[PDB]
Amino acid sequence: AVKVAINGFGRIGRLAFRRIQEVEGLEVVAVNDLTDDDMLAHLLKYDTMQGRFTGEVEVVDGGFRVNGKEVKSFSEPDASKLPWKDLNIDVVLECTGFYTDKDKAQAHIEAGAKKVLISAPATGDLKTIVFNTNHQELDGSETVVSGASCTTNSLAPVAKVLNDDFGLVEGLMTTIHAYTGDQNTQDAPHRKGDKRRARAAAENIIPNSTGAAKAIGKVIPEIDGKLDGGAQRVPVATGSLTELTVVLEKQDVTVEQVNEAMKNASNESFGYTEDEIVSSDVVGMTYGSLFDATQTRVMSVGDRQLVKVAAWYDNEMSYTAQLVRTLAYLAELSK
Amino acid sequence: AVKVAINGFGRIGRLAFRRIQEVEGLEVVAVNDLTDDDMLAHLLKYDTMQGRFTGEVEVVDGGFRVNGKEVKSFSEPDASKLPWKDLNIDVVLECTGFYTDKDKAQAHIEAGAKKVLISAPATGDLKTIVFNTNHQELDGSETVVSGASCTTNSLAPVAKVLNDDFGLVEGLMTTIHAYTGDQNTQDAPHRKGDKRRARAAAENIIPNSTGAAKAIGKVIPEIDGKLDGGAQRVPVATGSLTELTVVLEKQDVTVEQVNEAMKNASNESFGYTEDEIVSSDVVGMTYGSLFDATQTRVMSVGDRQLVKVAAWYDNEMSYTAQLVRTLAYLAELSK
Amino acid sequence: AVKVAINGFGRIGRLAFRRIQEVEGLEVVAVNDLTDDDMLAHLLKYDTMQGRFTGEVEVVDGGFRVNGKEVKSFSEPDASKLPWKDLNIDVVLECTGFYTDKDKAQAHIEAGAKKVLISAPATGDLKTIVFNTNHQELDGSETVVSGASCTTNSLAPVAKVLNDDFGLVEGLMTTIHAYTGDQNTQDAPHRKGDKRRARAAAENIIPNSTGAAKAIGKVIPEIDGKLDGGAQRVPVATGSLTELTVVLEKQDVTVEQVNEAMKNASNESFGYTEDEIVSSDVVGMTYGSLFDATQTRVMSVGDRQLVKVAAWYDNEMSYTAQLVRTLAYLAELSK
Amino acid sequence: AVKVAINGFGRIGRLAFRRIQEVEGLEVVAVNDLTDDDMLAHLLKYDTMQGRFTGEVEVVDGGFRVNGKEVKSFSEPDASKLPWKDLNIDVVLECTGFYTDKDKAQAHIEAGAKKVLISAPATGDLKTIVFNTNHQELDGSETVVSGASCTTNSLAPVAKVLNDDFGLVEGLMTTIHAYTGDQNTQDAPHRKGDKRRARAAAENIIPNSTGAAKAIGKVIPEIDGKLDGGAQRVPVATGSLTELTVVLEKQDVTVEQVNEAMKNASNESFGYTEDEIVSSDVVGMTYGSLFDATQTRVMSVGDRQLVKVAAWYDNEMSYTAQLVRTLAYLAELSK
Ligand code: NA
Ligand code: NA
Ligand code: NA
Ligand code: NA
Ligand code: NA
Ligand code: NA
Ligand code: NA
Ligand code: NA
Structure with a gap:
């Protein structure tokens, strides 16, 4: 499958995780956030507007057990020091708010992920992509992309x-x-x-x-x-x-x-x-x-x-689903 | 004192009563509403958005005593049967929803009122008035008017x-x-x-x-x-x-x-x-x-x-201020 | 499957419809309500707190087609004129509010339905049932029941x-x-x-x-x-x-x-x-x-x-789940 | 004239100010809060549940002008450094939440405030007072007091x-x-x-x-x-x-x-x-x-x-009304 890491477990990352459980061919292998995994699970299990989570979540050592899969967690503020190299990370969904500059999002690339999609408007020399409106402007040479x-x-x-x-x-x-x-x-x-x-x-x-x-x-x-x-x-x-x-x-x-x-x-x-x-x-x-x-x-x-x-x-979810569409297309541009 | 009658004691009709306390010259003498007086008094005294009634309200025999003044109370579905001539009504504020036409609202005039302001748009051959925008069009010959x-x-x-x-x-x-x-x-x-x-x-x-x-x-x-x-x-x-x-x-x-x-x-x-x-x-x-x-x-x-x-x-209260302004101006055209 | 009829398509009745979609062996074949079908479909289709309806709703000639099954729709004031004999109705779920009495509910039996479950407290000589608390007091001789x-x-x-x-x-x-x-x-x-x-x-x-x-x-x-x-x-x-x-x-x-x-x-x-x-x-x-x-x-x-x-x-839906549970029990008392 | 200083202009702070306007005998001469005066003045004029400020509020060199009175504005993290001496502060309202202990609040007394009322429960060798309930217990010896x-x-x-x-x-x-x-x-x-x-x-x-x-x-x-x-x-x-x-x-x-x-x-x-x-x-x-x-x-x-x-x-205002009662009572215990 496409190996996705989530950086930031806010509304957007948590919904991107939920959404990706519905999309075949994408698996979130890693979730990086400063919050303790106990609280993270609880915000994943329970959601005021998007409802209870579909499945079982439990905190295990090193991460979570979710619908019978392993999600590895990290509490690491320097994203250049996340082990994206040895996790074979295909795409990073960047949802922290501290990385909306392209030069600053290249840390995920240096940590060895192949492509990053910023879940916000972004500055720098990158492309801004709305799926099904202009993703046909992507030629695969891009390593950092704004999700608008x-x-x-x-x-x-x-x-x-x-x-x-x-x-x-x-x-x-x-x-x-x-x-x-x-x-x-x-x-x-x-x-x-x-x-x-x-x-x-x-x-x-x-x-x-x-x-x-x-x-x-x-x-x-x-x-x-x-x-x-x-x-x-x-x-x-x-x-x-x-x-x-x-x-x-x-x-x-x-x-x-x-x-x-x-x-x-x-x-x-x-x-x-x-x-x-x-x-x-x-x-x-x-x-x-x-x-x-x-x-x-x-x-x-x-x-x-x-x-x-x-x-x-x-x-929330209208934007999440469009992120996940673009996230996947970035992966498929790797042949 | 301009003698004012309120027909219908809903939101519009109760805010009018309240606003008229703060305008000297105008006096509500009668209120018509099919609801019993006890409940009406309660919704006057308490207001979720507009606040407690600055004063004192109590149900007496023929209606209410508000701030040491007598407000007559009727429970009468037929406007043309209201004792408006008995009370020398100068202008009726019509807030029920049932008389939003020129010829319908005319019932108030037959009952004795000098003039009628409809707290709503209205069909018929009447003028529609927004105070300080076009109330200069009133030439004194109008018995029935819309407050828009x-x-x-x-x-x-x-x-x-x-x-x-x-x-x-x-x-x-x-x-x-x-x-x-x-x-x-x-x-x-x-x-x-x-x-x-x-x-x-x-x-x-x-x-x-x-x-x-x-x-x-x-x-x-x-x-x-x-x-x-x-x-x-x-x-x-x-x-x-x-x-x-x-x-x-x-x-x-x-x-x-x-x-x-x-x-x-x-x-x-x-x-x-x-x-x-x-x-x-x-x-x-x-x-x-x-x-x-x-x-x-x-x-x-x-x-x-x-x-x-x-x-x-x-x-609510904006509309209400404008309606009382046009109320007063209508009773002003005795001159 | 057990044939269910719902009298009154208010919140309780539309939720009972929805929940029955998730119970195998249960079927809603008729709905009675004095509101037009067009408004009722729209309310079944869209819910503020319970979510988009799972499936597809359409208005067809004599009622509704929901998830590929027809559901007959009536706007019949008089309960005892309802074709429950012809629809082989095992249980009527009575949700209008006006038949919260044992003797009033007999009309559904007189119309040929087998059992009635009242979705509210009821008066008269009958039983009040909270599933998995006292439903074992049900012996099988009851025609009308209350679900508290x-x-x-x-x-x-x-x-x-x-x-x-x-x-x-x-x-x-x-x-x-x-x-x-x-x-x-x-x-x-x-x-x-x-x-x-x-x-x-x-x-x-x-x-x-x-x-x-x-x-x-x-x-x-x-x-x-x-x-x-x-x-x-x-x-x-x-x-x-x-x-x-x-x-x-x-x-x-x-x-x-x-x-x-x-x-x-x-x-x-x-x-x-x-x-x-x-x-x-x-x-x-x-x-x-x-x-x-x-x-x-x-x-x-x-x-x-x-x-x-x-x-x-x-x-809403906790009480819906309970009713449906008791409905199923009432029908399993086909000796 | 009891000269009052307010430390922290939060909900408790701004409402205490507002309450003090309608109390003859008290005046707020000073307010300390680290937020810029322009924002603080805006949040005093406009209140979502409590209404517009009755009066005039403007920002002036060195603080605020409110209803023709000067109110001095500082923004000092260090309470000990606040000029309570020079301003002859009779009582300070402690509304920041960070001084909720008697040896924390002392920092105001050393700064030359005669007395301190903490607007929350606070720990220490102090007294906790609900006006008109147990304020009879004050003797005049206290310099720091909690308002519960x-x-x-x-x-x-x-x-x-x-x-x-x-x-x-x-x-x-x-x-x-x-x-x-x-x-x-x-x-x-x-x-x-x-x-x-x-x-x-x-x-x-x-x-x-x-x-x-x-x-x-x-x-x-x-x-x-x-x-x-x-x-x-x-x-x-x-x-x-x-x-x-x-x-x-x-x-x-x-x-x-x-x-x-x-x-x-x-x-x-x-x-x-x-x-x-x-x-x-x-x-x-x-x-x-x-x-x-x-x-x-x-x-x-x-x-x-x-x-x-x-x-x-x-x-909000019930508590605040109580504070301003206790506060007033603490000041007059300086005969
Ligand atoms: Na998936
Ligand atoms: Na974490
Ligand atoms: Na007046
Ligand atoms: Na009445
Ligand atoms: Na079913
Ligand atoms: Na119908
Ligand atoms: Na004062
Ligand atoms: Na300040």
């Missing part, structure tokens, strides 16, 4: 259809977003100075910033610069919705043409629904974006149109 | 300015709106058949249909048909935000230009701020709309622009 | 192990309960004039009355009238905890004694845990009651003790 | 009545408690390793241990060791409830006795209500504890009785 953001993966396939079948001029975004753990529980000083994230996370509508629309050009170059936008974090623990309002070059555009162009590009990454769903219905899904045709909208005043669309995504 | 909806009251001052100072071509709207009492507590059939208002209210991001933007032109006739949009209901009990994405006819606009223009329009209906606030900060405010300059964005690609602005409101 | 309440099934295994291994002198119960559909979304008047259920459910801690404790004697007759209690309704949508504070006649009781007595009585209905779990961790589980050992407490002052124990239960 | 905990203040006036009037044999306690800032926002490793405080605070019923009941002896020594208990922390952001279940010497006790007993011992710390209220109703109250006579229960099985009672409190 959770919001980019909800956006990109919607923007690519908009732009491809209608010209894209410009557009703006709002992701009504689930609150995350970098928001405070009660009103208190926030570690990065953010006055809005400083506020009780489950009691408020909280504006905040998002890099995803501004960065999209890294995934779809031909629309680089043409998008920007924000977020509003609201009290659901996971589950998100990206609204996009655009101006298109093609004139006289219908709701029905938009919806039809999205449906035509459905696949495993990009879903499509016409059902009247809410956020909790997408918790745990494995689509990267679930285009919602109940919300397509065309405002027309003379020759001039504003077009608005919305796509769902579990900012 | 709680979303319209937060949209109008913003659209007015954008249309006046720059040329509003078209726009689209999303209100990240608190959840309301017509949403289901748990997943269950919905009495109006709405598949989204059927889901659990405080557990979901729920898309919904909004009336306000489609009908903005009853308040501002010169932008009729240029706005549309909807709501995202989210798990806060009150406090909302209206995002507006628009195309203007002035094509070299800046964020400064937009914000300054909004501050120049500042008053006791249209607040202005540059504090990074969140939804629970506007709970119980009496601005009908609080513009947020920190959220203004202008997007320029080539020489085409998109502009996004946002404004806060208590979908 | 969700809170009863959680308390009954625990109180039995307490009364058997030590003598129960008295006790008091508090269940920290998920809020339910019978509570209001916003502060508003309430169907049964309850000043507390009238308050916003997801925003308060709400005291409310219970019955499961005063009525324990129906399932355990030797401790009749020796328990009482109430509930505190809090903002989790599903998942509860029952705390029981008891006086025993056995006198040098220890935490280890209690816990061990509880562990030994463990079965498919009565779970045992020592993990430090929280409410969401039991959402969807199938134990009728999950004993939490980490919560056991003994207060000793001289020769006088006080013991406290606590058990989790998914107030 | 926000549950001890809740529990102590109910215990005392029970003990004096009926004679407390033993009892156990459960407090249904709002979730606090030390709980995680999302599932993650916890600062103190607590596996239950490691979980999403707003999406769970969470058991957690509390010392309050165990250490009740520090306030009412004549029932030391007689109580034990725990907490259930639920998704309300402030407002809590302490449920006590006791055994008494005096028997044949009625509900009407217990309730009149608590009615008579009611003061400005200890309230008493017979209304059907809920947690939100007690947010921002300034009783230390509010007795709920609607939740009194007397289980009488034959000869032996179990008694239960309950009392609400706002774990």
Whole structure:
């Protein structure tokens, strides 16, 4: 199988582990995190929004016993000193937050893994990849790859259809977003100075910033610069919705043409629904974006149109499943 | 003292009562609600989001004694049978849902009231009024008036300015709106058949249909048909935000230009701020709309622009402040 | 397979549908409810707390096709007109709320069904059953049965192990309960004039009355009238905890004694845990009651003790699992 | 004019400040907290559960201006280095959590503060005080004093009545408690390793241990060791409830006795209500504890009785109101 190591056992790594149990041909052989394995198991066994774990987890000496396999654990802050050489590590899923610079992620490579996928936006001379949107830009010469953001993966396939079948001029975004753990529980000083994230996370509508629309050009170059936008974090623990309002070059555009162009590009990454769903219905899904045709909208005043669309995504598992897809493809580029 | 009657003692109707305590000149003399007085008194005295009643409430024989004043109480399904002439009612606040038409609400007039303000949009040949946006259209000859909806009251001052100072071509709207009492507590059939208002209210991001933007032109006739949009209901009990994405006819606009223009329009209906606030900060405010300059964005690609602005409101108390303002002005046209 | 009909497709009925999908030898062939099929399918298809439906739901001509099997759907007010003779109905699961009486439920027999299980407490001369606590009192002569309440099934295994291994002198119960559909979304008047259920459910801690404790004697007759209690309704949508504070006649009781007595009585209905779990961790589980050992407490002052124990239960799906268990038993009494 | 210094401007700090504004005789001349003034001032003006600051708050050279008063701002880790001498600090409120021991708090006295009130339970040769419960014990000799905990203040006036009037044999306690800032926002490793405080605070019923009941002896020594208990922390952001279940010497006790007993011992710390209220109703109250006579229960099985009672409190402002009472009393013990 493809031998995967996870660096960081946060929400993302733990869900990537769960997800990989569902994907044949991938095995997590190693998990590196500073937390004690007792607590790590407990956060793996139990999950507030993603549910109980499917199977049995137990802490054994040197790691965990999970569904009858061995996962070796490490508590090692210098990733260059992890034994990726002798574990024959194919891909590292980098989920710590301390390694989003390519020059800094080359430690996994020096520790002898063959390829690293950063589970965040990343800086340096690397490629940023949204699976099924532009992974066909990977030629296998890459050793460090960005997995983009959770919001980019909800956006990109919607923007690519908009732009491809209608010209894209410009557009703006709002992701009504689930609150995350970098928001405070009660009103208190926030570690990065953010006055809005400083506020009780489950009691408020909280504006905040998002890099995803501004960065999209890294995934779809031909629309680089043409998008920007924000977020509003609201009290659901996971589950998100990206609204996009655009101006298109093609004139006289219908709701029905938009919806039809999205449906035509459905696949495993990009879903499509016409059902009247809410956020909790997408918790745990494995689509990267679930285009919602109940919300397509065309405002027309003379020759001039504003077009608005919305796509769902579990900012946890939607992004995890796209990571695992890209993770595997990186491996398969080794022949 | 202006003699005020409240028809229907729901959220709208009880907040009106509370707000009127803080306005001198106005006096609630009668309340009509089919609910027994004991329970009504209890929901007056206690309020989950709006607080304890600043004062003292008690059920006496013919109604309540509030702060040493007599409030008459009726339990009468038929408006035209209410003793409004007996009490010299100057204006009825109509909050039941059952008289949201010009000719229906006319029943209050036959019963004795001088004028009626409908706390809701209304069909018929009546004027719809957002105070400090278009109440100048009232010429004194109106017996029956609509106070518009709680979303319209937060949209109008913003659209007015954008249309006046720059040329509003078209726009689209999303209100990240608190959840309301017509949403289901748990997943269950919905009495109006709405598949989204059927889901659990405080557990979901729920898309919904909004009336306000489609009908903005009853308040501002010169932008009729240029706005549309909807709501995202989210798990806060009150406090909302209206995002507006628009195309203007002035094509070299800046964020400064937009914000300054909004501050120049500042008053006791249209607040202005540059504090990074969140939804629970506007709970119980009496601005009908609080513009947020920190959220203004202008997007320029080539020489085409998109502009996004946002404004806060208590979908309860904001709307309530505006309704009492229009109440007073309607009783003012005795002159 | 045993042919099951569900009267009333509310939370209990849709969950009973789902659980029966996981029991071999059990089949739901008909559902009665006054709501349209389109809304009912949507509610079976999408659940806020129990997850996307496992499988495929579609509305077909005379009802539903679910996982390749047709399910007849009726909207028939009158129970005794239901084609249960023609559908060879072994057990009707009665979940509407209006037939919580032995003699009222006879209508299902009069319609030709073989047995009725009432999914609530019921009055009249019949039996109240908590599976794996007192279902052996079922001899086979019963046509109508009650499956008690969700809170009863959680308390009954625990109180039995307490009364058997030590003598129960008295006790008091508090269940920290998920809020339910019978509570209001916003502060508003309430169907049964309850000043507390009238308050916003997801925003308060709400005291409310219970019955499961005063009525324990129906399932355990030797401790009749020796328990009482109430509930505190809090903002989790599903998942509860029952705390029981008891006086025993056995006198040098220890935490280890209690816990061990509880562990030994463990079965498919009565779970045992020592993990430090929280409410969401039991959402969807199938134990009728999950004993939490980490919560056991003994207060000793001289020769006088006080013991406290606590058990989790998914107030929805734990009670669903129990009902289905008793349904299967009722059908296995084909002599 | 009692000159007050506040060390740590957390929830306890900012609310103590707010409480002090409405108390004639006290003024906060200084605040020390390592967070920049700009952020601290923002978090004082805007509070999620407690409302906007009534008044004006601005940042000025050297600190804050609040309602036309100067408040000096420092940000010093070393308490000994703080200029309490020069500012003639009569009392310091110790609200950082890191000085919760008498030889730790002394660092303020050496700095020239006359007296110190620690806003938490603290260890050492000091006294632990619940105003209007055991503050009679202060003689004027103390320089450091603990204010106990926000549950001890809740529990102590109910215990005392029970003990004096009926004679407390033993009892156990459960407090249904709002979730606090030390709980995680999302599932993650916890600062103190607590596996239950490691979980999403707003999406769970969470058991957690509390010392309050165990250490009740520090306030009412004549029932030391007689109580034990725990907490259930639920998704309300402030407002809590302490449920006590006791055994008494005096028997044949009625509900009407217990309730009149608590009615008579009611003061400005200890309230008493017979209304059907809920947690939100007690947010921002300034009783230390509010007795709920609607939740009194007397289980009488034959000869032996179990008694239960309950009392609400706002774990924020109720405690804070109590502190500011004790603090004021410590200052006037400098005649
Ligand atoms: Na696998
Ligand atoms: Na580790
Ligand atoms: Na007034
Ligand atoms: Na009435
Ligand atoms: Na089955
Ligand atoms: Na039906
Ligand atoms: Na003062
Ligand atoms: Na500071």
